[PDB]
Design a protein around this nucleic acid. Structure first.
Ligand code: ILA
Ligand code: ILA
Ligand code: MG
Ligand code: ZN
Length: 860
RNA sequence: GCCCGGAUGGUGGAAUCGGUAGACACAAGGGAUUAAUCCCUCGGCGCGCGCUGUGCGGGUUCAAGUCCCGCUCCGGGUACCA
């Protein structure tokens, strides 16, 4: 051990230790209690960024802490390796997605290793491999065979030029990411998994997820968006088909003054026939972007159809308008409009002069003033014929019952949640195991034809998928006849919905899951990953868990006991536009940046004097080229410093705007820790500690050493406030370094303190602590060292600090025996001159005493 | 737009259940050492004190960064980025 802390030496040596001793390789060890600490596996995008480091350090932190408490700890790592970015990337570069992907893996594999995370590499999987997706393929056919998979047509961002399907991110203000040719809606038959058939289970079970944050439970709930309502069926004049709407407000039904139908809706088609203006509007309507966000900011636009539904209850003819915000894919693609009592229908009616008919009384039972807006709050019906006077509830049911009994209504449950569309029209993904025969008929790819390999050796024209470009590939034989397999590939969310299970038995060819290894490790105890995935990935995750329950593969209803969603690590992002429309993102490292007085970026320019559009902080991603790769910091300072720096920035759950400034503290703290163990162990062995014997100065110290341990443990295991944990530790160092060390007892305290510290540090900076255990002649490898237990008896306070306020204003602070009465505290408070200052001429009206902590003298 | 969050010194942040605002650091300035270590200073405004101060506006309480009502700005998601 040198005097100078030189992580460039220590870190690899410790890592190489871990590789060889296979420290974090774990088996289904039935003696030791298991803990399965899972961080959401990365997509291999090229380089680690800081966001991943927050994730995996939080992850390594809890894993190592947990091993330290004596548990058998699974911490796995792998590559969620299908996805878009490799497609674009592999052409820029003239490769196939596969070799670019595998090389991204090796590069990053290397980055995660040097950061010393304690992963069970024996368990690494790469989702692009047939060893892997063959199982999601077989599973899908099981689901198919079991009625949970279907085909409906679905709108897709089609580029009319390229004539190629684009993901929303490749749509830039309504244009194509390559050439500024305009994206259009195309409906395309696609595969769906009836996630909706598990809506109630997904919705109800959240109330059992005691250890999932509320943010995520609430987000998922609002997303599933279950409602009870009524579908209502209307006849239209001179049209042969009925129209159906879903409303949660049948109560407002006598206030229906129009219907609005989707551009795609046959009424709209039939009416277009003879109405050039409607025909225009529908044609316009494939400029409606396949994202909800636009579907909602876009201005509502609609053309009347000339058609007239019959209100089943009033008999009045009502206009059918075609509108741009009502979609066929989702529900009936026909809504019922009550302008008086829905803000969306208030706006619409205003704009196009439709009727704004009131039918619900203000809370006071008076007629609502509609002249500005809808009355949306529920209430007594009026001007609703036979239903007048009824409260919201009774009107709901009353209108429900009549429409039911007229056979045109029905009570129906609905969910905002739509089914999951897994068909992707792209190459780099697992092919969907479906098969169309000469028959014309469609079945699962036969068992014995799984997996359906995605070939890796391809020429990528960029525009088309190799497996759609080549006529031979689709060709198979099924049931004896020629058939064509599906050329669409899976939404890559599919691979990230079940990896957590495959990690328990990645090397198992007999099935999807060696359910004995799955049930040894499952459910995951803690699941760590971005807040970004609160909803989609997590909801697919639970879903899939449950489909795997429902296949007898796993025992528990839910996949993850605890969920830790870290905040997003963000960074300034910047683009210029290429000579034809191409958005070019420019790393913040390369941006030359002019700053405000509130410190905001005001101008930005790239190395070539390109003006840049600054976009603000957004999560770090290769998409905006704004990720900071830990690599340089790591090689200058070592993993431990980057790691502790990351955990110290702020608490896990809070989003964090990245800044390079602050590292060195973390680095200097580690030098202070090093120096102090160096110096303390240079004076050799210590006497056993004699507890009853120590100066009060030593007694205070030990009690801090012990309160820290308690705090850091409570911070790490209950709150996940690693930053406070660390600060609490730092302050102990500051104390420890101002403590005497010639005393036999000085040295013995120092030594207990320093073991407790070096262990407390370990989950954050295990390389330096591994080394520092050895010096302190710690028992064995620090990795399996037990977490330190605070001794209650070393933690009793004699006194306690009481804050003193007059009329709520702190005037004084006063140490006071823990066992102090209000009256002694009062009299004590009194002795303080600044308290006296404020009590002259005034009466104590009210005294408030928070025992042992605070005294307020309401004075008048 | 909707849903979820967030906002605190020059900076990141602490304050755990309504009780001390700024713990712990970074930056900066000054000093002791001829890059490294160490001191001191450090929310504002006028002092071994007074007032003020937790994005903005109201409000409840003895007491509000925290709770309630209305907002602003920022981030995440919004179903094909992952
Ligand atoms: C008071 C009744 C009105 C608010 C409205 N006609 C209505 O029926 N509201 S609803 O909750 O019952 N609707 C159920 C679903 O239908 C869609 N929807 C109904 N009306 C509109 C509208 N004007 N614009 C966009 N979407 C609309 C909603 O997305 C909701 O998902
Ligand atoms: C199962 C997880 C996903 C489906 C996917 N593999 C994925 O998110 N892959 S990743 O490379 O983008 N990220 C892996 C983990 O890192 C977190 N993360 C990614 N980017 C950031 C960021 N800017 N700030 C904070 N955290 C971030 C992800 O949420 C995921 O936990
Ligand atoms: Mg600030
Ligand atoms: Zn194009």
């Amino acid at each position: 051990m040198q005097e100078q802390y030189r992580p460039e030496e220590i870190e690899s040596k410790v890592q190489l230790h871990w590789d060889e001793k296979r420290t974090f390789e774990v088996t289904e060890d039935e003696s030791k209690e298991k803990y399965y600490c899972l961080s959401m596996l990365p997509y291999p995008s090229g380089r680690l960024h800081m966001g991943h480091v927050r994730n995996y350090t939080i992850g390594d932190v809890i894993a190592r802490y947990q091993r330290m408490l004596g548990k058998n700890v699974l911490q796995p790592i792998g590559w969620d390796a299908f996805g878009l970015p490799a497609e674009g990337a592999a052409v820029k570069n003239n490769t196939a997605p596969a070799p670019w992907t595998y090389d991204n893996i090796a590069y990053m594999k290397n980055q995660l290793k040097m950061l010393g995370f304690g992963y069970d590499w024996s368990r690494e999987l790469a989702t692009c491999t047939p060893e892997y997706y063959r199982w999601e393929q077989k599973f899908f056919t099981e689901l198919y065979k079991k009625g949970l998979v279907y085909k409906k047509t679905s709108a897709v961002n089609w580029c009319p030029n390229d004539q190629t399907v684009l993901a929303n991110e490749q749509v830039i203000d309504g244009c194509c990411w390559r050439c500024d040719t305009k994206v259009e809606r195309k409906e395309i038959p696609q595969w769906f998994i009836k996630i909706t058939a598990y809506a109630d289970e997904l919705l109800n079970d959240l109330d059992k997820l005691d250890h999932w944050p509320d943010t995520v439970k609430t987000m998922q709930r609002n997303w599933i968006g279950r409602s009870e309502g009524v579908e209502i069926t209307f006849n239209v004049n001179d049209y042969d088909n009925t129209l159906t709407v879903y409303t949660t407000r049948p109560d407002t039904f006598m206030g229906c003054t129009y219907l609005a139908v989707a551009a795609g809706h046959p009424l709209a088609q039939k009416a277009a026939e003879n109405n050039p203006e409607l025909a225009a509007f529908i044609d316009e309507c494939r400029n409606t972007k396949v994202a909800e966000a636009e579907m909602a900011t876009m201005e509502k636009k609609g053309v009347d159809t000339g058609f007239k539904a019959v209100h089943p209850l009033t008999g009045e003819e009502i206009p059918v308008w075609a509108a741009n915000f009502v979609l066929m894919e989702y529900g009936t693609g026909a809504v019922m409009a009550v302008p008086g009592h829905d803000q969306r229908d208030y706006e619409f009616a205003s704009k196009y002069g439709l009727n704004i008919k009131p039918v619900i009384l203000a809370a006071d039972g008076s007629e609502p003033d509609l002249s500005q807006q809808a009355l949306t709050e529920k209430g007594v019906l009026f001007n609703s014929g036979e239903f007048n006077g009824l409260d919201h509830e009774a009107a709901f049911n009353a209108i429900a019952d009549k429409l039911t009994a007229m056979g045109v209504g029905e009570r129906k449950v609905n969910y905002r949640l739509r089914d999951w569309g897994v068909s992707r029209q792209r190459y780099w993904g697992a092919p969907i195991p479906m098969v169309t025969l000469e028959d014309g008929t469609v079945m699962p790819t036969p068992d014995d034809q799984l997996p359906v390999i995605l070939p890796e050796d391809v020429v990528m024209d960029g525009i088309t998928s190799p497996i759609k470009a080549d006529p031979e590939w689709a060709k198979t034989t099924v049931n004896g006849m020629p058939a064509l397999r599906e050329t669409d590939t899976f939404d890559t969310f599919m691979e990230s919905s079940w990896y957590y299970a495959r990690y328990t038995c990645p090397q198992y060819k007999e099935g999807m899951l060696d359910s004995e290894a799955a049930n040894y490790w499952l459910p995951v105890d803690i699941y760590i990953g971005g807040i970004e995935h609160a909803i989609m990935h997590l909801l697919y995750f639970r879903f899939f868990h449950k489909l795997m329950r429902d296949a007898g593969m796993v025992n528990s209803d839910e996949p993850a006991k605890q969920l830790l969603c870290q905040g997003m690590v963000l960074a300034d992002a910047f683009y210029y536009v290429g000579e034809n429309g191409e958005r070019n993102w420019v790393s913040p490292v390369d941006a030359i940046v002019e700053r405000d007085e509130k410190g905001r970026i005001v101008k930005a320019k790239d190395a070539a004097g390109h003006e840049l559009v600054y976009t603000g902080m957004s999560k770090m991603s290769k998409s905006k080229n704004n990720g900071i790769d830990p690599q340089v910091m790591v090689e200058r300072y070592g993993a431990d410093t980057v790691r502790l720096f990351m955990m110290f920035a702020s608490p896990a759950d809070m989003t964090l705007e990245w800044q390079e400034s602050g590292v060195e503290g973390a680095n200097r703290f580690l030098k202070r820790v090093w120096k102090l163990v160096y110096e303390h162990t240079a004076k050799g062995d210590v006497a056993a500690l004699n507890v009853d014997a120590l100066t009060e100065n030593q007694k205070a110290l030990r009690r801090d050493v012990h309160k820290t341990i308690a705090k850091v443990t409570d911070d790490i295991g209950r709150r996940q406030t690693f930053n406070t944990a660390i600060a609490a530790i730092m302050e102990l160092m500051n104390k420890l370094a101002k403590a005497p060390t010639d005393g036999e007892q000085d040295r013995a305290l120092m030594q207990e303190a320093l073991l407790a510290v070096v262990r407390m540090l370990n989950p954050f900076t295990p390389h330096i602590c591994f080394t520092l255990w050895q010096e302190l002649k710690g028992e064995g490898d620090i990795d399996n060292a037990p977490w330190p237990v605070a001794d209650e008896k070393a933690m009793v306070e004699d006194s306690t600090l009481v804050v003193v306020q007059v009329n709520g204003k702190v005037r004084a602070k006063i140490t006071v025996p823990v066992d102090a009465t209000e009256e002694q505290v009062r009299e004590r408070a009194g002795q303080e001159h600044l308290v006296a200052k404020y009590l002259d001429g005034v009466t104590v009206r009210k005294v408030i005493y928070v025992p042992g902590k605070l005294l307020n003298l309401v004075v008048g």
